Structure 1
């Protein structure tokens, strides 16, 4: 739908279609994403229940409604600072050796004759790495796989309530059982003024926030380098870092994100009222020609590359450096093992927000 995007960016960068507002240009989406005083992330009524939550008035509730993701400062900033260092420079750099062997190990499990990279590499890598970060038994890998579907970017769909209940029951249970059998991060959360529901939420967020998204990054990366025949150039010129940033821009794992108007506001020429939902098209902004020259083309050594795939502002993705660090090592290690890659079959994930693949069958030449 990138062609429509380009038409909207030129005619109605800030457009209203009846029920919701939609922003298509880099300029305005960055604005919406950065300006929290006017465009809020309090979509689950977290701020309205913070007292009854920290007072005990509220006993049970879906924990995912109360995380740094659905909050505005100061609350947002209080929550984020508890773990804002676990995904740091020196910090993650120490997970490097672990990430390499892990992918190296996963690579060993592939059958070049024919195989699915999504299932054998793209799916497991992030899960195994986050389990290690959180201190959870890598043996419950499969469980984490199914709960990953609960990620916040995914909207509803008919007759799915029973399955979700089953997932939530087990998810919440699993997390309760391991609250004191965790790392420094979980410890910090467990020993905060936060409520029980909030602590559960926190852990679940850190747990499933980057599984499906990072998996999509790796898959999209393989598809793009392959279809544009960039593998040799990338190994030869060593463009992994930049090439991954271009993949993030061209094939964004999260196509859009939402905000709610905290009050009346004027975005560009439009005056969005108070309480209206504003859809921010990340995929569109990323092809903005004013900002990105030759944006429709995949330029592997683009630089700089100020894309908005990890968002912008105070909510800029907490695990971005991890995500980057993970994709880069997988791609490096992948490009070293197989000599040529043949794309045999593909099944795209059927979601409007999450952009990625369900299956990716390839024949590799060692």
Structure 2
């Protein structure tokens, strides 16, 4: 909520998990909601059918931040049955067995960027040169987007967390660019992600395809960049980077542990109960919105032994960083793969990587909910 100078959780989480599992919290908007922090409460909030996303569009419902965007055609603001139809299409697209035509593009973009880091001026900022551009360049290649337009996609997303009409403006260039992009691509015989989306509209409405495309690009850039910058910074400060260099087989569990520990937001999309719901820690009333804090759930000693310790070898790691239930992250398999190949390539090409400053000098983004370091200087 209030800017922290590092990636330390707010201590109000541990307090709420101990004795105030389902208490009000006042959000940046000034409105309040019940904050669920215990794993089991968050699990239930994310899986139960008795909560609605679409109800948060109603004019009286509470908001997390001040403003609009709040789009009625965004996947995150829909309920069954509409919601279910678009997800069926997305499983058909992000077929875990269609990733195979896509793995090479991920590795190629990593090799590209790690090479550039490798011959760059030390000390290098790993954010600007690696962690920020890797996911945007990946999403762009998969959407058949000219590399000349990637910086523009980055700024529109950054703008769309900037003051109302400036955010409507930037949403309007993205939607417009994307619909145009689409018109161009219809009729080519393509096999990229953008192509599979287009061809699902011949099950997706016009505005559905456009907004889904926009969201896939935004979703798959900001979160991954966040998690990866954070993950690398923890690897470097704990010295667990070296563990991955010496034992590359540990990279899978490291990815999971980074997801758990580095969950980029402390908050979550509100859920509205459509009737009185019993969660494990208590009953929450109909019409009283709940915030699921997956970040808090991820550091719950009921589930994770020694929750505040970062351990790349952690075997039991059912984190909620991809959410859960129906809104479970659509790009979960791509993201996990991006993270693995990122760590694989970087530890292979630069084993003797190390932070070029002390942790406490690194600055973190202030405001905009999502938390992450502003720069990660390294040398070797």
Question: Shorter-chain TM-score: what band?
Answer: 0.7 to 0.9
Aligned to 1:240: 251
Q: 1:297 to 1:62 in 2, by over 3 A?
A: closer
Aligned to 2:184: 181
Match of 2:171 among 161, 168, 173: 168
Aligned to 1:128: 137
- After superposition, what is the alpha-carbon deviation per residue over 1:158-207, rounded to whole angstroms, capped at 9, x for unaligned? x712421331221121012112334332313443352x333321221122
Within 2, Cα distance between the matches of 1:324 and 1:206? 15
> Is residue 134–residue 186 contact of structure 1 (8 Å, CA) maintained in 2?
no
Aligned to 2:228: 218
Number of residue pairs the alignment of both structures matches: 342
Unaligned runs of 5+ in 1: 47-60
Aligned to 1:88: 95
- After superposition, what is the alpha-carbon deviation per residue over 1:25-47, rounded to whole angstroms, capped at 9, x for unaligned? 00110000001x2111114549x
- TM-fit CA distance, 1:318: 0.6
- After superposition, what is the alpha-carbon deviation per residue over 1:261-318, rounded to whole angstroms, capped at 9, x for unaligned? 2223233453322222211111111011111011111111111310000001111101
SS class of match (1:16): strand
**RMSD over aligned Cα atoms:** 2.2
Within 2, Cα distance between the matches of 1:193 and 1:87? 15
> Is residue 124–residue 377 contact of structure 2 (8 Å, CA) maintained in 1?
yes
Q: Provide TM-score, normalisation by structure 2.
A: 0.83
Q: 1:112 to 1:329 in 2, by over 3 A?
A: farther
- TM-fit CA distance, 1:63: 8.4
SS class of match (2:157): helix
> Is residue 127–residue 141 contact of structure 1 (8 Å, CA) maintained in 2?
yes
Unaligned runs of 5+ in 2: 1-8, 27-31, 59-67, 186-193
> Is residue 179–residue 186 contact of structure 1 (8 Å, CA) maintained in 2?
no
> Is residue 36–residue 292 contact of structure 2 (8 Å, CA) maintained in 1?
yes
Q: Provide TM-score, normalisation by structure 1.
A: 0.86
> Is residue 72–residue 78 contact of structure 2 (8 Å, CA) maintained in 1?
no
- TM-fit CA distance, 1:357: 2.4
Aligned to 1:274: 286
Q: Which moved more, 1:83-92 or 1:326-335?
A: 83-92
Match of 1:28 among 41, 47, 58: 41
